[PDB]
Scaffold this motif. Structure first.
Motif, PDB file in Angstrom:
ATOM      1  N   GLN A 182      -3.704  -1.858 -38.440  1.00  0.00           N
ATOM      2  CA  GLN A 182      -2.718  -1.306 -37.516  1.00  0.00           C
ATOM      3  C   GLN A 182      -3.351  -1.139 -36.132  1.00  0.00           C
ATOM      4  OE1 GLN A 182      -0.793   1.529 -41.047  1.00  0.00           O
ATOM      5  NE2 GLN A 182      -1.611   2.418 -39.158  1.00  0.00           N
ATOM      6  N   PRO A 183      -2.551  -1.288 -35.070  1.00  0.00           N
ATOM      7  CA  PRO A 183      -3.099  -1.143 -33.715  1.00  0.00           C
ATOM      8  C   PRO A 183      -3.834   0.179 -33.433  1.00  0.00           C
ATOM      9  CG  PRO A 183      -0.699  -1.055 -33.710  1.00  0.00           C
ATOM     10  CD  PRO A 183      -1.111  -1.598 -35.043  1.00  0.00           C
ATOM     11  N   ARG A 184      -3.283   1.302 -33.876  1.00  0.00           N
ATOM     12  CA  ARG A 184      -3.965   2.567 -33.643  1.00  0.00           C
ATOM     13  C   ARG A 184      -5.350   2.601 -34.305  1.00  0.00           C
ATOM     14  NH1 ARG A 184      -4.126   7.875 -32.460  1.00  0.00           N
ATOM     15  NH2 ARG A 184      -4.685   9.380 -34.104  1.00  0.00           N
ATOM     16  N   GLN A 185      -5.439   2.182 -35.563  1.00  0.00           N
ATOM     17  CA  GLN A 185      -6.725   2.177 -36.253  1.00  0.00           C
ATOM     18  C   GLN A 185      -7.681   1.237 -35.537  1.00  0.00           C
ATOM     19  OE1 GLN A 185      -6.547   4.339 -38.779  1.00  0.00           O
ATOM     20  NE2 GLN A 185      -4.385   4.471 -38.151  1.00  0.00           N
ATOM     21  N   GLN A 186      -7.172   0.071 -35.169  1.00  0.00           N
ATOM     22  CA  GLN A 186      -7.954  -0.942 -34.482  1.00  0.00           C
ATOM     23  C   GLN A 186      -8.545  -0.437 -33.169  1.00  0.00           C
ATOM     24  OE1 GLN A 186      -8.378  -4.711 -35.075  1.00  0.00           O
ATOM     25  NE2 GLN A 186      -8.469  -3.634 -37.034  1.00  0.00           N
ATOM     26  N   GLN A 187      -7.768   0.340 -32.425  1.00  0.00           N
ATOM     27  CA  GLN A 187      -8.238   0.842 -31.148  1.00  0.00           C
ATOM     28  C   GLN A 187      -9.236   1.991 -31.200  1.00  0.00           C
ATOM     29  OE1 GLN A 187      -5.649   3.344 -28.635  1.00  0.00           O
ATOM     30  NE2 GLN A 187      -6.366   2.110 -26.889  1.00  0.00           N
ATOM     31  N   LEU A 188      -8.977   2.999 -32.029  1.00  0.00           N
ATOM     32  CA  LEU A 188      -9.871   4.153 -32.087  1.00  0.00           C
ATOM     33  C   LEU A 188     -11.101   3.967 -32.958  1.00  0.00           C
ATOM     34  CD1 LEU A 188      -7.350   7.147 -32.357  1.00  0.00           C
ATOM     35  CD2 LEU A 188      -7.812   5.689 -30.426  1.00  0.00           C
ATOM     36  N   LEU A 189     -11.030   3.064 -33.925  1.00  0.00           N
ATOM     37  CA  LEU A 189     -12.165   2.851 -34.812  1.00  0.00           C
ATOM     38  C   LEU A 189     -13.068   1.751 -34.260  1.00  0.00           C
ATOM     39  CD1 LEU A 189     -13.055   4.018 -37.589  1.00  0.00           C
ATOM     40  CD2 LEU A 189     -12.103   1.971 -38.605  1.00  0.00           C
ATOM     41  N   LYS A 190     -13.913   2.109 -33.300  1.00  0.00           N
ATOM     42  CA  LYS A 190     -14.809   1.141 -32.682  1.00  0.00           C
ATOM     43  C   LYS A 190     -15.831   0.627 -33.682  1.00  0.00           C
ATOM     44  CE  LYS A 190     -13.446   0.870 -28.333  1.00  0.00           C
ATOM     45  NZ  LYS A 190     -12.120   1.501 -28.562  1.00  0.00           N
ATOM     46  N   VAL A 191     -15.545  -0.523 -34.282  1.00  0.00           N
ATOM     47  CA  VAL A 191     -16.455  -1.110 -35.261  1.00  0.00           C
ATOM     48  C   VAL A 191     -16.308  -2.620 -35.308  1.00  0.00           C
ATOM     49  CG1 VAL A 191     -14.722  -0.505 -36.975  1.00  0.00           C
ATOM     50  CG2 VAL A 191     -16.955  -1.352 -37.706  1.00  0.00           C
ATOM     51  N   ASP A 192     -17.439  -3.319 -35.325  1.00  0.00           N
ATOM     52  CA  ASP A 192     -17.435  -4.779 -35.373  1.00  0.00           C
ATOM     53  C   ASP A 192     -16.591  -5.260 -36.553  1.00  0.00           C
ATOM     54  OD1 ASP A 192     -18.212  -7.543 -35.040  1.00  0.00           O
ATOM     55  OD2 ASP A 192     -19.705  -7.227 -36.621  1.00  0.00           O
TER      56      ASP A 192
END
Lengths: 350, 352
Positions: free
Chosen positions: A45-55
């Motif tokens: 999801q976009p929210r998870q993708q944005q806040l979870l800074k991980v390769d």
């Protein structure tokens, strides 16, 4: 590059009478995929993708390591619970890496918490928002345990960022940090979904399970990870290593200390729950065996890099290490292509 | 029957290992602090809201408050008066919760959702404690604060578990310390020794973290040893750390007591061996906490140790004398009449 590693691993697996026999390959795959599919859609999801800074490649490998751990060890819970548990433990593993300093974002932790404002730390913003999906499966007591252990875990990572193994002579530091980052109350409590267990009727057995399992689970992990660690140790600070530094003892004495604690923990786990509620014993049993199965199979623990170095010997040690490794891989070795698809990154776009 | 000889030996050894001695903390100062901390707290607990939501018998609250202020002022000797007052309030809330036998279950069903949404908590204790927590937390940095928040939460679960009066299943060796760490407030105490006005959390991160890890065990074990006399014949207190070792480990009270002393002594030695050479201010805070923590146990009648100082008051053995010497030392700086600081009573301020 101590090969003594086989010596200790053997007596443990034997003592616990490692057999697993949880699930049928068909079932394992059903669960592995279900858990992965829900988690994958969540993290994409976009929210998870944005806040979870991980390769991305790292997130993907982490999710697969976790979904396996959960599905393999939480063998008696519902599919949904495995999925939600997979999301929570993936969040914890992701954090386990972050090198970002928590200090600046934790300065208003309590006030924001007490006021109900989103936490400054992105991880907290995500984990807390998702938490109800895990907590809905449990009663208030267990839920409290999950909440606390995750809070401890957060502190544990903070401390780890200092890559400090303890002052020499600080005998208490080693285990203190381990319990702090071991998620033992989170794990041992998530083993009792209210859907199958009553917290009030099994309060004593659940509490006892949380206590005893916290150490079994973490020690068994430190033991299974002794290889992956020492090998390409990147300034690691594992329990064993910290035992050396803090207790001023050889890397052998330390390892022999862990192994002894593990063997004792296993002994007592059995003597206590052996004659209690059979359903409790079954869950504890499935966890122990599935947990060992998961360690021997997941690549992350590079235990293959050992089987392919002793399949030639046939004695007591290194002989049965291959006898066990065979057993595990025959039920636990499943191709990712059979369940982990599509990749998180793929669902992320679209 | 009580192991007075054995007890005396370990107590003396403990006091030797920690270098129990005199401080520049004068009685005139102690009384200044005692009264200050007690006065802010008394007024706090005397507020109607505190009076409504905090279910405690008035006399036990007065006594609980007086025991906690003593502990804080005597052990957190290097912190400001405000910090002593605020920690006195927090540690009184925690002590007071032991008086509740009400099942936390129904008041915890919506714990997380209420927390996350910012809605006042259903369990009244949490409502008062979280409302007041910022007063304690303002004296600390984020790292230390997180430790205070976590330990208090652990404490809540500890009280919940204790409501079952469970000493552990025979064979469950990991149960005793698991419970003691749960209800001990080790990380709360250990971390509250470092106000941000006197210490730089980040500059001393390793020092602080280490003190927390070692202090958690020193404090709880020392307390278990000091309370061991008052609970020997107490048929009401059935689940202490030592009584649980007896039940969970399946050993004798002596073996369990023997287990406690060794842990208490090794803990003391390693404390000294680790911090003696570290930052001087840190070792000072640590040394005062230990001395004060022991002085407090020896001077608070709650523990009834004077009953031991009076039984072996004039024996010609070495330990007995070494003990009486230490005890008298404590009484000189610690033995203070409550009328000199603890007034007026909370009840009188509440009624006003």
């Amino acid at each position: 590059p101590t090969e003594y590693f086989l010596n200790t691993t053997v007596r443990l697996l034997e003592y616990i009478r490692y057999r697993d026999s949880n699930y049928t390959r068909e079932e394992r795959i059903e669960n592995l995929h279900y858990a992965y599919n829900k988690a994958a859609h969540h993290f994409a999801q976009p929210r998870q993708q944005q806040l979870l800074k991980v390769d991305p490649k790292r997130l993907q490998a982490s999710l697969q390591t976790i979904v396996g751990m959960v599905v393999y060890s939480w063998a008696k819970v519902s599919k949904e619970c495995m999925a939600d548990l997979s999301i929570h433990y993936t969040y914890t593993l992701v954090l386990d890496d972050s090198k970002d300093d928590p200090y600046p974002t934790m300065v208003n932790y309590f006030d924001d918490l007490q006021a109900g404002r989103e936490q400054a730390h992105p991880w907290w913003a995500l984990v807390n928002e998702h938490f109800p999906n895990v907590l809905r499966h449990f009663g208030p007591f267990c839920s409290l345990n999950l909440i606390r252990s995750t809070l401890d875990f957060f502190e544990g990572c903070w401390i780890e960022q200092y890559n400090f193994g303890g002052f020499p002579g600080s005998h208490d530091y080693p285990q203190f940090l381990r319990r702090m980052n071991g998620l033992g109350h989170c794990v041992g409590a998530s083993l009792w979904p209210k859907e199958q267990f009553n917290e009030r009727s099994l309060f004593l057995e659940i509490t006892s399970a949380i206590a005893q399992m916290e150490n079994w689970m973490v020690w068994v992990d430190d033991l299974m990870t002794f290889y992956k660690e020492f090998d390409d140790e990147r300034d690691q600070i594992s329990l064993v290593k910290n035992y050396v530094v803090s207790d001023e003892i050889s890397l052998h004495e330390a390892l022999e200390k862990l192994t002894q604690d593990t063997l004792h923990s296993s002994k007592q786990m059995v003597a206590v729950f052996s004659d209690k509620d059979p359903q409790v014993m079954d869950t504890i049993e499935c966890f122990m065996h599935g947990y060992v199965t998961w360690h021997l199979c997941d690549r992350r623990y590079r235990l293959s890099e050992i089987y392919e170095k002793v399949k030639e010997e046939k004695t007591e040690d290194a002989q049965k290490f291959c006898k066990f490794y065979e057993q595990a891989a025959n039920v636990g070795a499943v191709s990712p292509s059979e369940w982990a698809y599509p990749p998180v990154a793929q669902l992320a776009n679209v």
